[PDB]
Design a protein around this motif. Sequence first.
Motif, PDB file in Angstrom:
ATOM      1  N   UNK A 248     -15.692  -2.221   2.063  1.00 17.39           N
ATOM      2  CA  UNK A 248     -15.252  -3.247   2.832  1.00 17.39           C
ATOM      3  C   UNK A 248     -14.294  -4.284   2.192  1.00 17.39           C
ATOM      4  N   UNK A 249     -13.807  -3.740   1.142  1.00 19.15           N
ATOM      5  CA  UNK A 249     -12.440  -4.866   0.525  1.00 19.15           C
ATOM      6  C   UNK A 249     -11.229  -3.972   1.077  1.00 19.15           C
ATOM      7  N   UNK A 250     -10.138  -4.764   1.159  1.00 17.95           N
ATOM      8  CA  UNK A 250      -8.684  -4.105   1.564  1.00 17.95           C
ATOM      9  C   UNK A 250      -8.172  -3.381   0.285  1.00 17.95           C
ATOM     10  N   UNK A 251      -8.120  -2.054   0.543  1.00 18.79           N
ATOM     11  CA  UNK A 251      -7.680  -1.001  -0.346  1.00 18.79           C
ATOM     12  C   UNK A 251      -6.106  -1.415  -0.765  1.00 18.79           C
ATOM     13  N   UNK A 252      -5.283  -1.628   0.202  1.00 16.57           N
ATOM     14  CA  UNK A 252      -3.795  -1.716   0.289  1.00 16.57           C
ATOM     15  C   UNK A 252      -3.407  -2.711   1.277  1.00 16.57           C
ATOM     16  N   UNK A 253      -2.557  -3.368   0.782  1.00 19.29           N
ATOM     17  CA  UNK A 253      -1.896  -4.400   1.564  1.00 19.29           C
ATOM     18  C   UNK A 253      -0.576  -3.792   2.129  1.00 19.29           C
ATOM     19  N   UNK A 254       0.357  -4.671   2.889  1.00 18.36           N
ATOM     20  CA  UNK A 254       1.559  -4.403   3.485  1.00 18.36           C
ATOM     21  C   UNK A 254       2.531  -5.242   2.957  1.00 18.36           C
ATOM     22  N   UNK A 255       3.562  -4.723   2.219  1.00 20.83           N
ATOM     23  CA  UNK A 255       4.743  -5.398   1.978  1.00 20.83           C
ATOM     24  C   UNK A 255       6.004  -5.519   2.990  1.00 20.83           C
ATOM     25  N   UNK A 256       5.492  -5.981   4.099  1.00 19.64           N
ATOM     26  CA  UNK A 256       6.347  -6.096   5.313  1.00 19.64           C
ATOM     27  C   UNK A 256       5.754  -6.871   6.300  1.00 19.64           C
ATOM     28  N   UNK A 257       6.479  -6.835   7.636  1.00 15.65           N
ATOM     29  CA  UNK A 257       5.836  -7.783   8.934  1.00 15.65           C
ATOM     30  C   UNK A 257       5.871  -9.231   8.417  1.00 15.65           C
ATOM     31  N   UNK A 258       7.146  -9.674   8.140  1.00 13.15           N
ATOM     32  CA  UNK A 258       7.179 -11.053   7.783  1.00 13.15           C
ATOM     33  C   UNK A 258       6.722 -12.038   8.864  1.00 13.15           C
ATOM     34  N   UNK A 259       6.680 -11.695  10.258  1.00 13.61           N
ATOM     35  CA  UNK A 259       6.298 -12.482  11.193  1.00 13.61           C
ATOM     36  C   UNK A 259       4.818 -12.189  11.463  1.00 13.61           C
ATOM     37  N   UNK A 260       3.932 -12.755  12.289  1.00 13.19           N
ATOM     38  CA  UNK A 260       2.605 -12.665  12.422  1.00 13.19           C
ATOM     39  C   UNK A 260       2.318 -11.172  13.039  1.00 13.19           C
ATOM     40  N   UNK A 261       1.687 -10.400  12.303  1.00 12.56           N
ATOM     41  CA  UNK A 261       1.565  -9.002  12.743  1.00 12.56           C
ATOM     42  C   UNK A 261       0.457  -8.995  13.963  1.00 12.56           C
ATOM     43  N   UNK A 262       0.633  -8.925  15.052  1.00 12.01           N
ATOM     44  CA  UNK A 262      -0.340  -8.711  16.076  1.00 12.01           C
ATOM     45  C   UNK A 262      -0.251  -7.329  17.039  1.00 12.01           C
ATOM     46  N   UNK A 263       0.236  -6.217  16.258  1.00  9.06           N
ATOM     47  CA  UNK A 263       0.532  -5.021  17.142  1.00  9.06           C
ATOM     48  C   UNK A 263       0.254  -3.811  15.992  1.00  9.06           C
ATOM     49  N   UNK A 264      -0.447  -2.787  16.532  1.00 11.26           N
ATOM     50  CA  UNK A 264      -0.285  -1.477  15.709  1.00 11.26           C
ATOM     51  C   UNK A 264      -0.465  -0.166  16.717  1.00 11.26           C
ATOM     52  N   UNK A 265      -0.151   0.785  16.065  1.00  9.73           N
ATOM     53  CA  UNK A 265      -0.092   1.853  16.834  1.00  9.73           C
ATOM     54  C   UNK A 265      -0.384   3.380  16.047  1.00  9.73           C
ATOM     55  N   UNK A 266      -0.465   4.499  16.593  1.00  4.74           N
ATOM     56  CA  UNK A 266      -0.890   5.779  15.747  1.00  4.74           C
ATOM     57  C   UNK A 266      -0.278   6.894  16.632  1.00  4.74           C
ATOM     58  N   UNK A 267       0.495   7.617  15.843  1.00  4.45           N
ATOM     59  CA  UNK A 267       0.802   8.972  16.528  1.00  4.45           C
ATOM     60  C   UNK A 267       0.558  10.194  15.518  1.00  4.45           C
ATOM     61  N   UNK A 268      -0.651  10.580  15.995  1.00  7.02           N
ATOM     62  CA  UNK A 268      -1.289  11.651  15.121  1.00  7.02           C
ATOM     63  C   UNK A 268      -0.985  13.241  15.713  1.00  7.02           C
ATOM     64  N   UNK A 269       0.229  13.088  16.440  1.00  3.66           N
ATOM     65  CA  UNK A 269       0.587  14.582  17.015  1.00  3.66           C
ATOM     66  C   UNK A 269       1.235  15.509  15.911  1.00  3.66           C
ATOM     67  N   UNK A 270       2.289  14.861  15.384  1.00  6.96           N
ATOM     68  CA  UNK A 270       2.747  15.609  14.411  1.00  6.96           C
ATOM     69  C   UNK A 270       3.370  14.859  12.979  1.00  6.96           C
ATOM     70  N   UNK A 271       2.676  13.395  12.831  1.00 15.65           N
ATOM     71  CA  UNK A 271       3.008  12.613  11.725  1.00 15.65           C
ATOM     72  C   UNK A 271       1.779  11.800  11.578  1.00 15.65           C
ATOM     73  N   UNK A 272       1.871  10.875  10.660  1.00 20.48           N
ATOM     74  CA  UNK A 272       0.925   9.907  10.385  1.00 20.48           C
ATOM     75  C   UNK A 272       1.014   8.664  11.429  1.00 20.48           C
ATOM     76  N   UNK A 273       0.033   7.868  11.087  1.00 16.31           N
ATOM     77  CA  UNK A 273       0.140   6.544  12.001  1.00 16.31           C
ATOM     78  C   UNK A 273       1.139   5.466  11.463  1.00 16.31           C
TER      79      UNK A 273
END
Lengths: 320, 44, 36
Positions: free
Chosen positions: A182-207
Motif C-alpha cells: 500500500x505504500x508508495x514505492x517511488x515518487x516522481x521528480x517532475x510535474x510541477x503543476x497539479x498532475x491530473x492526467x495519466x496515460x499508458x501505451x502498452x503497444x511497443x513501450x512502457x506506460x
Amino acid sequence: KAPTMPKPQWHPPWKLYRVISGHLGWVRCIAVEPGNQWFVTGSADRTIKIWDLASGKLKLSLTGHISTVRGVIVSTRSPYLFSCGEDKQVKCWDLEYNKVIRHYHGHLSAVYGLDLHPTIDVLVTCSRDSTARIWDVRTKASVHTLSGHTNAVATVRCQAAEPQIITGSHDTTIRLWDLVAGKTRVTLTNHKKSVRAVVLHPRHYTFASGSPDNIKQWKFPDGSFIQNLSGHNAIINTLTVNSDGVLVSGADNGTMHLWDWRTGYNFQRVHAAVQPGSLDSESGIFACAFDQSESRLLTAEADKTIKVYREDDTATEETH
Amino acid sequence: RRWDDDVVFKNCAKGVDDQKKDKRFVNDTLRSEFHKKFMEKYIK
Amino acid sequence: KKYYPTAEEVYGPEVETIVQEEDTQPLTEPIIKPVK
C-alpha cells in the motif's frame, strides 16, 4: 540539429465526423465498450447514458447519482459498467439488469476516477477526500487504503505490467503505491503543476504519464524520464494514446493538441469549435478515449456535445 | 359554403412559423424547451 | 416564436451533428442478451 529530427513517426491528421449532443451539462467522462458497440458517457445531469459506438444514436439512459458523474469505467473482464459519482458513492451499475447491483461506499468526499484492474479482481477508485480506495469487486468491501497523496488523487492507473498502482495526485507528486503493501514505492521528480492526467501505451513501450504544465514521459519499472512534452501550457485533463503511435492531449482550453508518442512533435494541434447555445470560451476536452477498433477517436467536450473524430488519408503534412 | 362570411382572419396555417415544433437542442438551459414548458405549465 | 443561431454552420456542414433526446431501448437490449 535535434536528435532524431529528420526521422519522425507517421501520423495522418484526423477530422470530426459526427458531433452527438444529447446530454444536459458538461460531460465529465467517456468510455467505449470492448465489443465496439456501446459508448458509455456520463454528464453533469447525474445520468450515465450509453450510446452506439458506431451509429452514434442513443441506446440507453441510466440515472441514479446525486451529483455529477465524473467517472465511467466499463469493465471488459466482466459485464458491469461501474461508475464513480461525486456524491461519495461508487455506484457499480451492473449491465446485467440495467440497475445498481453493488452500491459500494467508503469514500469521505467525491470520487475523481475509477479504473478496473485487468488481472486482480478489484476496482481502484481514485477518490478526492484524502486518498484512493482499493474496492474489491463482488465483495462490497475495501482491500487497503493507499494513502500516499498530499492532495486529491485525480488520476489512476491499474496496469498488469506495473506491480504497483500508479496514482495521480494533485499535490504535484505522482506516486506508485503497491497493491499488497500500500505504500508508495517511488515518487516522481517532475510535474510541477497539479498532475491530473495519466496515460499508458502498452503497444511497443512502457506506460507514459502527463501533467498540465511541463509534462513528461515515464517508464513502468520504477519510473524513468525519457523526454518532456511540447509547448502545451493549458490545463490538460484528457491524455489518450493509441497503439498506432498517436498521442492525443485533451486540455480545458479546447486546444486538442495531437502529438506522437515516439517523435513528440504535435501532428495536428487543432482546436475544436463550440455549441451555438454554449458560451464563447466554454469548449474544453474533459475526457477523451479512442475506440475499441482504434478507428474513430472520441472526445467528450465541456460544451455538452460528445464529438467523434474520424480519420482521413493525407500526405502533405511533413514536419520539419 | 357561406358559413364564414364575417371572419376577419381567414386562415393562419402556421403554428410556430418555422417548423412543426422546435426539434433543436441548445446548451442554454433558460432558452430551451425544458424551461419554456416549466414556465408555461407550472407558472401562470 | 424564437431567435437563435443554427447549429449547422457552427459545427460545419460535413459533421452530421445529431441530437438524440430519448425513447430508445428502455433498459432491455443492453440489459439482457438478445433473442438469438
